[PDB]
């Protein structure tokens, strides 16, 4: 698992497109190498300074060596390595590089999320699916940073120090450093797993307590069904105590981890210092070697202080990146595109042949359904409240797929046509239109982006909404939606009419809204529909009399099956739609 | 080490 | 401002109630003092070790001094001071202390939020008001910790080092350390303000980008009104680029701050080291004084690496704590309790005298309204859809206050009575009842907590819901609400009936629900209401004929004013409620 | 000295 995940990380490391960023990557790697070299060099110069000082050297050489050592200590981090001029140049350049990868990953995720089929988006919520994506991009960035620039450099420092001590200092100090660092790493990992178990146990109860508090605040019914303020306080207190117990366990585990790491490094330092002092007394080592060993041990210790955290974060980011990859691979485009060739929209003839469709498991909704609309002619659909009418509207728009049957537009099966042209050629008015947070002019032009402002104004005039736009103070810069002011029913229905005018479609998949409003504005809206649906193939879905009376072919659906066919007056005489119209609306 | 988690 | 805020923090420091925690506080302060002492002591022992080593001392004294120095370096932090045995004991004991303060503050806030009047809760949302409280408790805890244990210790270390160098080392090193630290602090603050401006500028755009992504994901209408996937992708990319530019500016400012701090410490180290080396060559100082100065300068530097962060966090937590205090002081209990004395509920006679009430600004809803209900008699309220009926129901329950007039229960004005007994004696059935996430048995006993399980089962039987509880698999342990399964209308109406049976009230402020359901279950529910409202004063609010026909005194409200008074048949003959009943429901 | 904040 480690090998494959490292392979994916390495694949994401190199910027594929720009050449100006690979140079920056190489410079950053070179700076990392230079930091390792400085890590080795500085204690050596400290030893040289002490050795020169102990033998009464003249002022000139001492001054120049002191200046050089101070300069090296400035280049290296004055503390914890995250401080020097080097590695800060590195943070700068890696800012510039990591920005590119973050943008690319975010755009790839956002461009994949917009092509999955509808059933996928009706299934899962939006908050969870966006949390996974955000956490995935943060995971890839943090994994690259953490590993490459904080974990491998330290494991290289340990090995380099082992080599230097074992070859250029003595033989036993190699054993000392090796044993100390091995024990440190082993104990850190072993304690860290245990502490992770405790941390998860605490986090669950924290979330539960927050939920309880939110629930007690939202329902101000505590006053009604009792004087139960005290009870809601007491349950909150009990939950708080439970959470506090778990938190105490977790943080005591943290303190234990810190103490064991400190004890290991202290034992190593004690052994090394005692051996070095004994050797110095026996004229085998010089006075500077003592401070060399002390400084180098502290220098090794400082990065090691943050390895439990790195272990935790590496594991978490690995599982997160696996989640993000497994939704990137989820190629559920079930209503995909086999073949190509744009639909030839001559006039707008729609056909049906005993189509079979079933999206709800077990039961089947649409069976043996076939009808036809002449170009320009208007068809209506009436029946009991359910899904069949909206379902067939969705089927015509190529959202789901037909299990068995045939469905054509102008003698052309839409199963073999590209989705883009199909969806471009067909207009529609939904149940309730939604205006995203932007200006009114932008919402109008959203029907066709390339169009200019004059078309926007002309269509707003054509839809009878332009005066109400002038009623707003700012006008065409007015903030709309949740951020801006709220809109009444006629306003949003008219803006939908405006944008569907902009789109200039051939078929209007009208779906009349059931929103309650004054009859005058309602009849104005229906008139606007009448002059926008003129000379265009139309399919109307409504529970009202207005669509029924003037339509050309009324259809009735019972459990997703055609029971009555024909015209308004024949259905009236049959004793069918007559009873439904008299009972439903009266 | 933070608590970062 | 600083003095006042420090006074409040100091007031919160000392645990007022338990004695076992003040001992822990004193021990923690003593440990802080011991850490300062070790901070002074360790470099002195390092100098002693070097001095003994350079003069060829025998092995015994060297061994014991080395062991003592290693022990002191173990007690003191092996790195950055947050690592030693001391201050880790302190973190342990302060865990135990800080849990107490966190609990007390959280419970104070939660007990104050449940006593504010209704208008306050209808005004503000719940997420914002809970965010302020959570951030306030975190702010007080973090302020105490940050200041007391991380800011004053460092400013004490700087002063102690200045004194030690200026008195026991030489005169010029005092100047060196003083100037270095003064420049460090000044530059840190000056750069930090600039950087926080940049940080806020970046955070706003980050939030905007997240909102844009959320909006584009929620509205899967992009496919509908165009093939506008590309347009949404491009807008997302532009927003990303804007956020990225702001992020680059902020983090470059961070790098500049790091570099200026490092340069200041490097200049100080260079000056000190050069002067110390020159003095050593001139036989004025010993060899160990050099390593003393170097170690002590590094030791001073290490805590100082995190002062921009502490400045930012101190400012943000101060403003957050002020927000929390200013909502703790918001004593807006406008429907307060002047006087005391529980209401004497003899039988349940309700009176009214031309009450004047107006909660909506400008217009007034209730004016010149007066009626009376005999004990046991049922009164109904009918009229156009609005607020007057629910408004008067709220007024009877002492939610708002009467601007002018009189309202009595059993010849006793409720303005002079305590709210607890009033709300205890009056039951209520709301528009839609809500079941918080818990078991069914708990939701039933929520009407009266002290009651046992047998009463719960008896009332569930009396309300005709008990069999449906047995239908659930777990039964009385079934998870209900958002966490658990969903419930139908009759189920929640019956659980409301059950809990109001448990409460055993005298007046039933019935408010019939408008939820659509089958007529059989509806009439069963109405029958249950009839046998639960028997022998109890009742006020019924509904749009249905069932309450109207059998009531004892029908009242009609027009713009919050009584227009028709009397019985069902008189109102029928008047030509009033007759037209309304025939038009509204038919 | 993240970043926190
Ligand atoms: Cd942090």
Author numbering:
A (entry chain B), C (entry chain A): 241 to 826
B (entry chain C), D (entry chain D): 101 to 105
Question: Please, what does the article write about this entry?
Answer:
ATP-binding cassette transporter B6 (ABCB6), a protein essential for heme biosynthesis in mitochondria, also functions as a heavy metal efflux pump. ATP-binding cassette transporter B6 (ABCB6) is a homodimeric Type IV half-transporter comprising a single transmembrane domain (TMD) and a nucleotide-binding domain (NBD) with an N-terminal extension (TMD0). The TMD is responsible for substrate recognition and translocation, while the NBD is involved in ATP binding and hydrolysis, providing the energy required for substrate transport. In the present study, we determined cryo-electron microscopy (cryo-EM) structures of human ABCB6 in complex with a Cd(II) ion, which is coordinated by two molecules of either GSH or PC2, at resolutions of 3.2 and 3.1 Å, respectively.
Interestingly, the stimulatory effect of Cd(II) on hABCB6core activity was also observed when PC2 was present, resembling the response seen with GSH. The structures of hABCB6core in complex with Cd(II) and GSH (or PC2) are shaped like a lassical inward-facing transporter in which the substrate-binding cavity within the TMD region is open towards the cytoplasm. Superimposition indicates that the two structures are nearly identical, with a Cα root-mean-square deviation (r.m.s.d.) of 0.6 Å. The overall binding mode of Cd(II) with PC2 in hABCB6core is very similar to that of Cd(II) with GSH, although the molecular basis of complex formation differs. Specifically, the two cysteine residues of each PC2 molecule participate in Cd(II) coordination to form a tetrathiolate. The glycyl unit at the C-terminus does not participate in interactions with nearby residues and remains freely exposed within the binding cavity. Although human ABCB6 in vivo would not encounter PC2, which is primarily found in plant and certain fungal cells, the high conservation of the mode of complex formation and the residues involved in binding GSH and PC2 suggests that ABCB6/HMT-1/Atm1-like transporters share a common evolutionary origin and mechanism for heavy metal binding and export across diverse organisms. The CASTp program calculated that the cavity volumes of the Cd(II)-bound structures in complex with GSH and PC2 to be approximately 2312 Å3 and 2573 Å3, respectively. The smallest tilt difference of 3.9° is observed between the apo and Cd(II):GSH (or PC2)-bound states, with a clockwise rotation of one NBD with respect to the other NBD.
